[PDB]
Design a protein around this nucleic acid. Structure first.
Ligand SMILES: Nc1nc2c(ncn2[C@H]2C[C@H](O)[C@@H](COP(=O)(O)OP(=O)(O)CP(=O)(O)O)O2)c(=O)[nH]1
Ligand SMILES: [Mg+2]
Ligand code: NA
Ligand code: NA
Ligand code: NA
Length: 326
DNA sequence: CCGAACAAGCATCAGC
DNA sequence: GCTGATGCTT
DNA sequence: TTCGG
């Protein structure tokens, strides 16, 4: 982390614009600048040097000059003193509380963890589970625990139907030594873009992971996307493990490669890659890559038989997952 | 200067 | 009930 | 907030 102080500042600015100002484009600009700087392999010595990188403009360059001179940013230090800003920023750390709900809660004088706990009745289901596991959800998962969880998920899925294929994506698939949560891509040959030949494909997997007490709570759940909570089992008399966020995405079997590209990320990598696709005349979602016609209307899905096929279409060199951690 | 900035599933709510 | 917008999330 | 045209 050559430039950890700079990228921390930019990330804190990003979070302020998202949570407090509700300025999504400023938030993306700071995150993008933080991303391009994190992979820059020199210790930055001036805002001018940083402004040579794409995504760092005049305003971020000036902030880097102030940071490098003083070790601080006056704008952030004032933001940190403001009670409303600090409280809104804090409340958004609860899963299910966003900028709108956080500002609504602070308006009614709900502005601390203890305030949240005594007003459970004012939370929706998702928010209540995010409050319940607030402490756990801020801990990272050592890859060794990710490996144990993987083994549980893949084996339980196989007991439901040997034709399911579960793939752990996210930062885990990118080779990270720790992960924020577990991301599972799921396919079944009964579910393709051409037909759904079995109902309850995702449900059966969820209920089986619940029966073996791996899934403990549900944040949201539909036919193709599950967002919930899981926990490794612990040995006799040992401390329990923290509860962990788990996301499961059922994707049409024939669209696996677009799906695993999507779910491997990173999120910024996906944004960069989809934006480049547009510049090249394609649009990419988790299902397909399609060309844009004369009027910018999406055309027919193109054939895809690997992740690299997608990179080829937009004329990017193939990047292994471990090189997508933007 | 100015328009564009990735794409979408689930929960919730207003309106009919 | 449905449609469509918005919030929040991946 | 940044960038391309
Ligand atoms: N097009 C897009 N795609 C996205 C987006 N947000 C998330 N994703 C995709 C890519 C993520 O890796 C994947 C998982 O989402 P997750 O939050 O778990 O990201 P990890 O890479 O695993 C970091 P960790 O803290 O969990 O370790 O979902 C998005 O806005 N736009
Ligand atoms: Mg993840
Ligand atoms: Na630049
Ligand atoms: Na939140
Ligand atoms: Na996730």
């Amino acid at each position: 982390t050559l430039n950890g102080g700079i990228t921390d500042m930019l990330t804190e600015l990003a979070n302020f614009e998202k949570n407090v100002s509700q300025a999504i484009h400023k938030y993306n600009a700071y995150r993008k600048a933080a991303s391009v700087i994190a992979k820059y392999p020199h210790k930055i010595k001036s805002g001018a040097e940083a402004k040579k990188l794409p995504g760092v403009g005049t305003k971020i360059a000036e902030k880097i000059d102030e940071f490098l001179a003083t070790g601080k940013l006056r704008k952030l230090e004032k933001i940190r003193q403001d009670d409303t800003s600090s409280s809104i920023n804090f409340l958004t750390r609860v899963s299910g509380i966003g900028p709108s709900a956080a500002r609504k809660f602070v308006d009614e004088g709900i502005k601390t963890l203890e305030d949240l706990r005594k007003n459970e009745d004012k939370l929706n289901h998702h928010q209540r589970i995010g409050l319940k596991y607030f402490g756990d959800f801020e801990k990272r998962i050592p890859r060794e625990e990710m490996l144990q969880m993987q083994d549980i998920v893949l084996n339980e899925v196989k007991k439901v139907d040997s034709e399911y294929i579960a793939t752990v994506c996210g930062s885990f698939r990118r080779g990270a030594e720790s992960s924020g949560d577990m991301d599972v891509l799921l396919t079944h040959p009964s579910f393709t873009s051409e037909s759904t030949k079995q109902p309850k494909l995702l449900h059966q997997v969820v209920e089986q992971l619940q029966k073996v007490h791996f899934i403990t709570d549900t944040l949201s759940k539909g036919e193709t996307k599950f967002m919930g909570v899981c926990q490794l089992p612990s040995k006799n008399d040992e401390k329990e493990y923290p509860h962990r966020r788990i996301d499961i995405r059922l994707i049409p079997k024939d669209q696996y490669y677009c799906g695993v590209l999507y779910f491997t990320g990173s999120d910024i990598f996906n944004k960069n890659m989809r934006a480049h696709a547009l510049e090249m005349g394609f649009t990419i979602n988790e299902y397909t890559i399609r060309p844009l016609g004369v009027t910018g209307v999406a055309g027919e899905p193109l054939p895809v038989d690997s992740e690299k096929d997608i990179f080829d279409y937009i004329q990017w060199k193939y990047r292994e997952p471990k090189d997508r951690s933007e």
